[PDB]
Each structure stands twice: as C-alpha cells, then as structure tokens.
C-alpha cells in the first residue's frame, strides 16, 4: 500500500521481557537517547519521542550516556554487537554523526531501513537487568 514503515527484526537473545516504543510514536520523532552501559554490556535504554521520555528499560547500575539530537536530525542506520546480551550500539544520523555506545566485541549486526529515505521512528526489544535484544522500526517523519 502507501506505508513506508519497516522493521529490522530482533537482534540478540530471547531472554528477558519484551518492550516496545510503538505507543510513544505519537509523542514525536526521536530527539534524544539514553544508553546505560557497564564494562561489558548495554544495561538500559531510554528514548525521547518529542518531549516525552519512554519508560526506562533495563538495569540501573552503569554509566548513563546520553546524546541529544540536533533539530531535524534523524537516525538512518543502527549497527551493534551482542554476545548473550547487547554489547554495542552505533546510531548513524543523517547529519553524518556516528553515536557509539558500549564495548566493541561480539556478533555484529547492521540495520538499515527497508524503504529508502525513511528514518528510525521507534525501538523495541527485550530487557531484564540488561538489554537482551533490540529491534529497529523505520518510517517517514513527519507523518
Ligand atoms: Cl549470543
């Protein structure tokens, strides 16, 4: 039909419990990221949609890294690495910024939109005390 949405599928394990930011789309485009990291793993994730933060997922012991996107800036590619749990995330923006988090070891993955000229609209995944898995949802913005 007319829709340009696409979904990467889940990268990582089947552990933990599912989360989805699908209901956060209405708040706005992604405008900021919070990624909690310890020495080995991605511990936790929060994403700001417009002005409103998602409900935090993951554990709380770790360095809380945060990146604030520039006005009009979107993510167009996400890569990373996992081994048992998520270990590395790289958010690539349409302003050419490569926003890396975590430690550079594990099985690699690389997710780009399945329809051209769409951007990262929200994320889903699985979590517990760590981030077990992540999935990327792409769409046009504005809608
Ligand atoms: Cl694994």
Numbering used by the authors: 20 to 162
From the paper:
Zymogen granule membrane protein 16 (ZG16) is produced in organs that secrete large quantities of enzymes and other proteins into the digestive tract. ZG16 binds microbial pathogens, and lower ZG16 expression levels correlate with colorectal cancer, but the physiological function of the protein is poorly understood. One prominent attribute of ZG16 is its ability to bind glycans, but other aspects of the protein may also contribute to activity. An intriguing feature of ZG16 is a CXXC motif at the carboxy terminus.
Here, we describe crystal structures and biochemical studies showing that the CXXC motif is on a flexible tail, where it contributes little to structure or stability but is available to engage in redox reactions. ZG16 crystal structures also draw attention to a nonproline cis peptide bond that can isomerize within the protein and to the mobility of glycine‐rich loops in the glycan‐binding site.
